[PDB]
Amino acid sequence: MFKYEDIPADYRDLMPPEARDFLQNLSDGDKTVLKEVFKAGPYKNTEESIAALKKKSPELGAKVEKLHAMVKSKIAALGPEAKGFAEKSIEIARGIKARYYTGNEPTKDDLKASVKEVLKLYKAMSDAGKADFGKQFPFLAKVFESGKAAKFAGE
Ligand SMILES: CCCCCCCCCCCCCCCC(=O)O
Ligand SMILES: CCCCCCCCCCCCCCCC(=O)O
């Protein structure tokens, strides 16, 4: 059973507050249902994974759906470069998440390595790409721009 404390506090500080509060709120039952849905995967896409979740839990399914629709609409407003970055960042974050469901949770060095890559991809974008991303994701843009992500990653 995954516990919120399993994630280092300084990595949780890099996550947007809505994502942090979603995870912090999880009951023991919520975590069982998330793990069972993940284990009954893989799925065609995120939407199919959420539909399977809603079947087990209309309430947790609706909570996940609300977060997902907000992220999906923010990505839809991006130009091709910032969309590519956001989608690659999500793929990296999902691989980290997969490790908390399956055996052997990521180490702090594994998390530092994932942030280091996401930051590198952020820095690889043009200024127009960074500005486009920042308009939709101001918390994450600030984590990158302030040096907060670099401090965690170690560099
Ligand atoms: C990241 C916001 C939550 C998104 C919806 C799925 C939540 C269930 C995940 C449980 C395992 C915790 C994973 C922590 C690492 C990470 O979120 O990147
Ligand atoms: C069952 C938990 C999964 C919910 C994850 C919600 C937070 C991440 C949102 C990013 C969506 C990316 C676009 C959809 C791509 C796809 O369907 O493969």
Author numbering: 0 to 154
From the paper:
Fatty acid and retinol-binding proteins (FARs) comprise a family of unusual α-helix rich lipid-binding proteins found exclusively in nematodes. They are secreted into host tissues by parasites of plants, animals and humans. The protein Na-FAR-1 derives from the blood feeding intestinal hookworm of humans, N. americanus. The 3D structure of Na-FAR-1 in its ligand-free and ligand-bound forms, determined by NMR (nuclear magnetic resonance) spectroscopy and X-ray crystallography respectively, reveals an α-helical fold similar to Ce-FAR-7, but Na-FAR-1 possesses a larger and more complex internal ligand-binding cavity and an additional C-terminal α-helix.
Na-FAR-1, which had not been subjected to reverse phase HPLC purification to strip out co-purifying ligands, crystallized as previously reported and diffracted to 2.14 Å. Molecular replacement using the Ce-FAR-7 structure proved unsuccessful and we therefore obtained the crystal structure of Na-FAR-1 in complex with co-purifying ligands, hereafter referred to as holo-Na-FAR-1, by anomalous dispersion from crystals of Se-Met-labelled protein. Na-FAR-1 presents a wedge-shaped structure with two larger faces each of approximately 40 by 30 Å in area and of ∼17 Å in width at the wide end of the wedge. The fold is organized into 11 helices of various lengths, defining an internal cavity. The internal cavity is much larger for the holo protein, achieved by a global outward displacement of the surrounding helices by a little over 1 Å compared with the apo form, with the biggest changes seen at the C-terminal end of helix α7. In the holo form, the cavity is more than twice as big, reaching 2570 and 2170 Å3 for probes of 1.4 and 1.925 Å respectively. In the holo structure the expanded cavity is lined by the same residues as in the apo structure, but with 21 additional, predominantly apolar, side chains contributing to the surface of the expanded cavity (Phe1, Ile6, Leu25, Lys30, Lys34, Val36, Ser48, Ile49, Leu52, Met69, Phe84, Ala85, Ile91, Ile95, Tyr99, Leu110, Ser113, Phe132, Phe136, Val142 and Ala148). In addition to the opening seen in the apo form, the cavity is also accessible to solvent via an opening between the α2–α3 and α9–α10 turns and α6. Within the cavity of the holo form, clear electron density was observed that is well fitted by a single FA molecule, containing 16 carbon atoms. The palmitate appears to be curled into a C-shape around the side chain of Lys96 and contacts 11 other residues (Phe1, Ile6, Met14, Phe21, Leu22, Leu25, Leu33, Leu66, Ile95, Tyr99 and Tyr100).
